[PDB]
Coordinates of C-alpha atoms and ligand atoms in Angstrom, one line a residue:
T1 CA -9.4 -2.8 -16.2
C2 CA -11.0 -3.0 -12.7
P3 CA -8.2 -4.2 -10.3
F4 CA -8.7 -7.4 -8.3
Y5 CA -8.4 -5.6 -4.9
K6 CA -11.7 -3.6 -5.8
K7 CA -13.7 -6.9 -6.2
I8 CA -15.4 -8.9 -3.5
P9 CA -15.2 -12.7 -4.2
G10 CA -18.3 -14.7 -4.0
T11 CA -20.5 -11.7 -4.8
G12 CA -21.3 -9.5 -7.7
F13 CA -19.9 -6.5 -5.7
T14 CA -17.2 -3.9 -6.3
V15 CA -15.9 -1.2 -3.9
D16 CA -14.9 2.3 -5.1
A17 CA -14.8 1.1 -8.7
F18 CA -16.6 3.8 -10.7
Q19 CA -13.9 4.8 -13.3
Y20 CA -13.7 1.5 -15.3
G21 CA -17.1 1.9 -17.1
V22 CA -19.4 -1.1 -16.7
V23 CA -17.5 -3.8 -14.7
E24 CA -18.5 -7.1 -16.1
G25 CA -21.0 -8.9 -13.8
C26 CA -21.2 -6.2 -11.1
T27 CA -24.7 -6.1 -9.6
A28 CA -23.9 -3.5 -6.8
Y29 CA -21.3 -0.7 -6.7
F30 CA -20.4 0.3 -3.1
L31 CA -18.8 3.7 -2.3
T32 CA -16.9 4.0 1.0
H33 CA -16.6 7.8 1.1
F34 CA -16.9 11.0 -0.9
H35 CA -13.2 11.5 -1.9
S36 CA -12.4 12.0 -5.7
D37 CA -10.0 9.0 -6.1
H38 CA -12.8 6.9 -4.8
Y39 CA -15.9 8.4 -6.6
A40 CA -14.1 9.2 -9.8
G41 CA -16.5 8.4 -12.6
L42 CA -19.9 9.0 -10.9
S43 CA -22.3 11.5 -12.4
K44 CA -26.1 12.1 -13.1
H45 CA -25.8 9.5 -15.9
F46 CA -24.9 6.6 -13.7
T47 CA -27.8 4.1 -13.7
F48 CA -26.6 1.2 -11.4
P49 CA -27.4 0.8 -7.7
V50 CA -24.9 2.6 -5.4
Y51 CA -24.7 1.6 -1.8
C52 CA -23.2 4.0 0.8
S53 CA -23.8 5.9 4.0
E54 CA -26.6 8.6 4.4
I55 CA -24.0 11.4 4.3
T56 CA -22.2 10.1 1.2
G57 CA -25.7 9.7 -0.3
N58 CA -26.4 13.4 0.4
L59 CA -23.2 14.4 -1.4
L60 CA -23.9 12.1 -4.5
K61 CA -27.4 13.7 -4.8
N62 CA -26.4 17.3 -4.2
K63 CA -22.8 17.7 -5.5
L64 CA -22.7 15.1 -8.4
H65 CA -26.5 15.1 -9.2
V66 CA -26.7 11.3 -9.1
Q67 CA -30.4 10.5 -9.4
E68 CA -32.1 9.5 -6.3
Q69 CA -33.6 6.1 -7.5
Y70 CA -30.0 4.8 -7.8
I71 CA -28.8 5.9 -4.4
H72 CA -29.2 3.3 -1.7
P73 CA -28.1 4.8 1.7
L74 CA -27.7 2.3 4.6
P75 CA -27.7 3.1 8.4
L76 CA -24.5 2.3 10.3
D77 CA -24.1 -0.6 12.8
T78 CA -27.2 -2.4 11.3
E79 CA -27.4 -5.8 9.6
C80 CA -28.7 -5.2 6.1
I81 CA -29.4 -7.5 3.1
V82 CA -28.0 -6.4 -0.4
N83 CA -28.7 -8.9 -3.3
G84 CA -29.1 -11.6 -0.8
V85 CA -25.8 -10.9 1.0
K86 CA -25.8 -9.7 4.7
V87 CA -23.6 -6.5 5.0
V88 CA -22.9 -4.0 7.8
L89 CA -21.4 -0.4 7.5
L90 CA -19.1 0.7 10.4
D91 CA -17.6 4.1 11.1
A92 CA -14.1 4.4 9.5
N93 CA -12.9 7.5 11.5
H94 CA -11.9 9.1 8.2
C95 CA -13.9 12.0 6.8
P96 CA -17.7 12.6 7.3
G97 CA -19.8 9.7 6.0
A98 CA -16.7 7.4 5.5
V99 CA -17.4 3.7 6.2
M100 CA -15.9 0.3 6.4
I101 CA -17.9 -2.7 5.1
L102 CA -18.4 -6.1 6.6
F103 CA -19.6 -8.7 4.0
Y104 CA -21.0 -12.1 5.2
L105 CA -20.6 -14.5 2.3
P106 CA -23.2 -17.3 1.7
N107 CA -20.4 -19.9 2.1
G108 CA -19.4 -18.5 5.6
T109 CA -16.4 -16.3 4.8
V110 CA -16.5 -12.9 6.4
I111 CA -14.7 -10.0 4.6
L112 CA -13.9 -6.5 6.0
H113 CA -13.1 -3.7 3.6
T114 CA -11.7 -0.7 5.5
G115 CA -12.2 1.8 2.8
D116 CA -9.9 4.7 4.0
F117 CA -9.7 4.6 7.9
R118 CA -7.8 5.8 10.9
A119 CA -7.7 2.8 13.1
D120 CA -8.7 3.4 16.7
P121 CA -9.1 1.2 19.8
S122 CA -12.8 2.1 19.8
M123 CA -13.3 -0.1 16.8
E124 CA -12.4 -3.1 19.0
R125 CA -15.9 -2.7 20.6
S126 CA -18.0 -2.3 17.5
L127 CA -19.8 -5.3 15.8
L128 CA -16.3 -6.4 14.7
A129 CA -15.6 -8.0 18.0
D130 CA -18.6 -10.5 17.6
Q131 CA -17.1 -12.7 14.8
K132 CA -14.0 -13.7 13.0
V133 CA -12.8 -12.1 9.7
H134 CA -11.0 -14.2 7.2
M135 CA -10.0 -11.6 4.6
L136 CA -9.1 -7.8 5.3
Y137 CA -8.9 -5.3 2.5
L138 CA -6.7 -2.7 4.3
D139 CA -6.0 1.0 3.8
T140 CA -2.1 0.8 3.8
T141 CA -1.5 4.6 3.1
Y142 CA 1.1 4.9 5.9
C143 CA 2.3 1.3 6.2
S144 CA 5.9 2.0 7.1
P145 CA 7.4 2.6 10.5
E146 CA 8.6 6.1 9.7
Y147 CA 5.0 7.3 9.7
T148 CA 4.3 8.5 13.3
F149 CA 2.0 11.4 14.1
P150 CA 0.2 12.9 17.1
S151 CA -3.4 12.3 18.1
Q152 CA -5.9 14.5 16.4
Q153 CA -6.7 15.9 19.8
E154 CA -3.1 17.1 20.4
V155 CA -3.0 18.7 17.0
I156 CA -6.3 20.6 17.6
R157 CA -5.1 21.8 21.0
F158 CA -2.0 23.2 19.2
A159 CA -4.0 25.0 16.6
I160 CA -6.6 26.5 19.0
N161 CA -3.9 27.9 21.3
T162 CA -1.9 29.2 18.4
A163 CA -4.8 31.0 16.9
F164 CA -6.3 32.3 20.2
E165 CA -2.9 33.8 21.2
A166 CA -2.3 35.5 17.8
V167 CA -5.6 37.1 17.5
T168 CA -5.7 38.2 21.2
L169 CA -2.2 40.0 20.6
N170 CA -3.5 41.4 17.3
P171 CA -7.3 41.8 16.8
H172 CA -6.7 42.8 13.2
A173 CA -5.1 39.4 12.3
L174 CA -7.1 37.1 9.9
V175 CA -6.9 33.3 10.3
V176 CA -7.0 31.2 7.0
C177 CA -7.4 27.4 6.7
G178 CA -6.9 25.4 3.6
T179 CA -9.1 22.6 2.2
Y180 CA -9.5 20.6 -1.0
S181 CA -12.1 17.9 -0.1
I182 CA -14.3 17.0 2.9
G183 CA -12.5 15.9 6.0
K184 CA -10.6 17.7 8.7
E185 CA -13.5 20.1 9.5
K186 CA -12.4 20.0 13.2
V187 CA -9.5 22.2 12.4
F188 CA -11.4 25.3 11.2
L189 CA -14.4 24.7 13.4
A190 CA -12.4 24.4 16.6
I191 CA -10.5 27.6 15.8
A192 CA -13.7 29.5 14.9
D193 CA -15.3 28.4 18.2
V194 CA -12.4 29.6 20.4
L195 CA -12.4 33.0 18.6
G196 CA -16.2 33.4 18.7
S197 CA -16.4 33.8 14.8
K198 CA -18.2 31.8 12.1
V199 CA -16.1 30.3 9.3
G200 CA -16.5 32.1 6.0
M201 CA -16.3 30.2 2.7
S202 CA -17.4 30.1 -0.9
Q203 CA -21.0 29.1 -1.7
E204 CA -19.8 25.7 -3.2
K205 CA -18.0 24.8 0.0
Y206 CA -20.9 26.0 2.2
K207 CA -23.1 23.7 0.1
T208 CA -20.8 20.7 0.7
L209 CA -20.7 21.3 4.5
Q210 CA -24.6 21.5 4.6
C211 CA -24.7 17.9 3.3
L212 CA -22.8 16.5 6.3
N213 CA -25.4 16.3 9.2
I214 CA -23.1 18.2 11.6
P215 CA -25.1 19.5 14.7
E216 CA -25.5 23.3 14.8
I217 CA -23.7 23.8 11.5
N218 CA -25.9 26.9 10.7
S219 CA -24.4 28.4 13.9
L220 CA -20.7 27.8 12.8
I221 CA -20.4 28.5 9.0
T222 CA -21.4 31.3 6.6
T223 CA -20.9 32.6 3.1
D224 CA -20.6 36.2 4.4
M225 CA -16.8 36.7 4.5
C226 CA -17.0 40.2 5.9
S227 CA -18.5 39.2 9.2
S228 CA -15.9 36.3 9.7
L229 CA -12.3 36.2 10.9
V230 CA -11.7 32.6 10.0
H231 CA -11.7 32.1 6.1
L232 CA -11.5 28.8 4.3
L233 CA -9.7 28.8 0.9
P234 CA -8.6 26.1 -1.6
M235 CA -5.4 24.4 -0.5
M236 CA -3.8 25.7 -3.7
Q237 CA -4.2 29.3 -2.5
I238 CA -2.3 28.5 0.8
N239 CA 1.1 30.1 -0.1
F240 CA 2.6 33.6 0.1
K241 CA 1.4 34.9 -3.3
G242 CA -2.1 33.4 -2.8
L243 CA -2.4 34.9 0.8
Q244 CA -1.0 38.4 -0.1
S245 CA -3.6 38.4 -2.8
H246 CA -6.4 37.4 -0.5
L247 CA -5.3 40.0 2.0
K248 CA -5.6 42.8 -0.6
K249 CA -9.2 41.6 -1.2
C250 CA -10.2 42.3 2.4
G251 CA -9.8 46.1 2.0
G252 CA -7.7 47.0 5.0
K253 CA -9.9 45.2 7.6
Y254 CA -6.8 43.1 8.4
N255 CA -3.0 43.6 8.5
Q256 CA -1.8 40.0 9.2
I257 CA -2.6 36.4 8.2
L258 CA -2.1 33.3 10.2
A259 CA -2.7 30.3 7.8
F260 CA -3.0 26.5 8.5
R261 CA -2.1 23.7 6.0
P262 CA -3.3 20.5 7.6
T263 CA -1.2 18.0 5.7
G264 CA -1.1 14.2 6.0
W265 CA 2.5 13.4 7.0
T266 CA 5.6 15.4 6.5
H267 CA 9.3 14.4 7.3
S268 CA 9.4 17.0 10.1
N269 CA 7.5 14.2 12.1
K270 CA 10.6 12.0 12.5
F271 CA 12.3 14.8 14.4
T272 CA 9.8 17.3 15.6
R273 CA 7.2 17.1 18.5
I274 CA 3.9 19.0 18.1
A275 CA 4.9 21.5 20.8
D276 CA 8.0 22.2 18.6
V277 CA 6.3 23.2 15.2
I278 CA 7.1 26.6 13.7
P279 CA 5.7 28.5 10.8
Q280 CA 7.2 29.8 7.6
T281 CA 6.9 33.6 7.7
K282 CA 7.2 36.3 5.0
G283 CA 6.3 39.8 5.9
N284 CA 3.0 39.9 7.8
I285 CA 2.1 36.3 6.7
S286 CA 2.7 33.1 8.6
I287 CA 2.0 29.5 7.4
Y288 CA 1.8 26.5 9.7
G289 CA 2.0 22.9 8.3
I290 CA 0.1 20.8 10.9
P291 CA 0.1 16.9 10.8
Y292 CA -3.7 16.3 11.2
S293 CA -4.1 12.8 9.7
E294 CA -7.4 10.9 8.8
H295 CA -5.4 7.8 8.0
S296 CA -3.9 5.3 10.5
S297 CA -0.3 5.8 11.6
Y298 CA 1.9 2.6 11.2
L299 CA 1.5 1.7 15.0
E300 CA -2.3 2.3 14.9
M301 CA -2.6 0.0 11.8
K302 CA -0.4 -2.6 13.3
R303 CA -2.4 -2.7 16.6
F304 CA -5.7 -3.1 14.6
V305 CA -4.4 -5.9 12.5
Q306 CA -2.8 -7.8 15.4
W307 CA -6.2 -7.4 17.3
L308 CA -8.3 -8.7 14.3
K309 CA -6.0 -11.6 13.3
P310 CA -7.2 -11.9 9.7
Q311 CA -6.2 -15.0 7.7
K312 CA -5.3 -13.0 4.6
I313 CA -4.5 -9.3 4.1
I314 CA -5.1 -7.4 0.7
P315 CA -3.6 -3.9 0.5
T316 CA -5.6 -1.2 -1.3
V317 CA -2.9 1.6 -1.2
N318 CA 0.7 1.8 -2.5
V319 CA 0.1 -1.3 -4.6
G320 CA 1.6 0.1 -7.8
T321 CA 5.4 -0.7 -7.2
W322 CA 7.1 -4.0 -6.5
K323 CA 9.3 -2.6 -3.8
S324 CA 6.1 -1.2 -2.0
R325 CA 4.2 -4.4 -2.2
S326 CA 7.1 -6.5 -1.1
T327 CA 7.9 -4.3 1.9
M328 CA 4.2 -4.3 3.0
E329 CA 4.0 -8.1 2.9
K330 CA 7.2 -8.3 5.1
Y331 CA 5.5 -6.1 7.8
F332 CA 2.3 -8.3 7.6
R333 CA 4.5 -11.3 8.3
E334 CA 6.3 -9.6 11.2
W335 CA 2.9 -8.7 12.8
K336 CA 1.6 -12.1 12.4
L337 CA 4.7 -13.8 14.0
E338 CA 4.9 -11.3 16.8
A339 CA 1.2 -11.8 17.8
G340 CA 1.1 -15.7 17.1
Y341 CA -1.8 -16.0 14.6
Ligands
NI1 NI1 -10.0 9.3 1.5

């Protein structure tokens, strides 16, 4: 049954609740972003209003074939009225089109639902600064102190330098980047840009990227693999068997693969600096695991919450075990006592 943490009290609204069939008494279904655990259940047969960002609206229309009369895209940073309730969509710093949602209840409660987000100090100068939030529905993906990772900027620097160096030493090396969903486009686009190549990918993937309102995308991507030395493949195929295979397919245009697997977190983060990352190598194939996160680290999350000072926190991630739940509630209490709210 629809869980309580996907329901907005005092409204007929749900958030990311498309896999439960008809949710009793739901008058508007909000979608934070186009990732499968969140959209699961949408299709061309959905006949209720869906509210979302313009980019997420493009992906519903073109990838899932949701009919246009049920898609209600909203501009960001703009006060809008949905079924008589004032709402604002804010940038979530997650994947393209990902939003957080501010609900202004008739009775005067203000509710922020983060969707998936990577908290950042820039959010402290959005519309959020202008009024108090009583309840926070928080993306708690990495809510434990062991989760540290570098800035996105430091990680992209690492990848750019690595790739530029390898291909300048060997102009017959191919770079491969793994993907299984939107997000993390900066990885493969930054590399292609430093090498003066377009990124080659399947037609299905090129279609997905054309939905995202990225400036000058026609200049950076292509479905012609031959003319490209940065290839995007499914994340599944980023392993020695999968890469040896792909290399055979290129017909001796290339003699070496350098591949990137942008993962969330890995236990090498507790020990290893970004400067200190090494690949796994077999033969003429090297694989780099890089910690490019589109979720908040524990410290980023803690700062955002201590800044916002909500009266109640509702976790949306890692809620399935008692030990998880109970550990998160302990951190919330530490944060609150340390900051004085
Ligand atoms: Ni997500």
